[PDB]
Amino acid sequence: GVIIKQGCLLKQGHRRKNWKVRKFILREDPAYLHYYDPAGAEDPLGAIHLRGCVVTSVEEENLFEIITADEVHYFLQAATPKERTEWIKAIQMASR
């Protein structure tokens, strides 16, 4: 799978609804969005199978959400609206 996009974002705790910085790597052959420790561990902390996902902005600034085909929800926060828009479209093209 080839790398499409790469960057850090704030991801909301599924858990206690907290927010944490993670490094995200979007790939396209296999449609996947992996997240790691904000550091340099390339062994992922989780994976998001993107095939058939739904990704939309959420009206905390620059929020957007990912809904997997089986309805697991991911809440992310970009640093700027331009970044958010870029991630959303990238994720959309990847799960083609």
UniProtKB/Swiss-Prot annotation:
Q: Where is the signal peptide?
A: none
| Organism per entry | Homo sapiens
Q: What does this protein do?
A: Major protein kinase C substrate of platelets.
The protein's name in its UniProt record = Pleckstrin
Shown part of the complete sequence: 243 to 347 of 350
User: Domain named PH: which ranges?
Assistant: 2-96
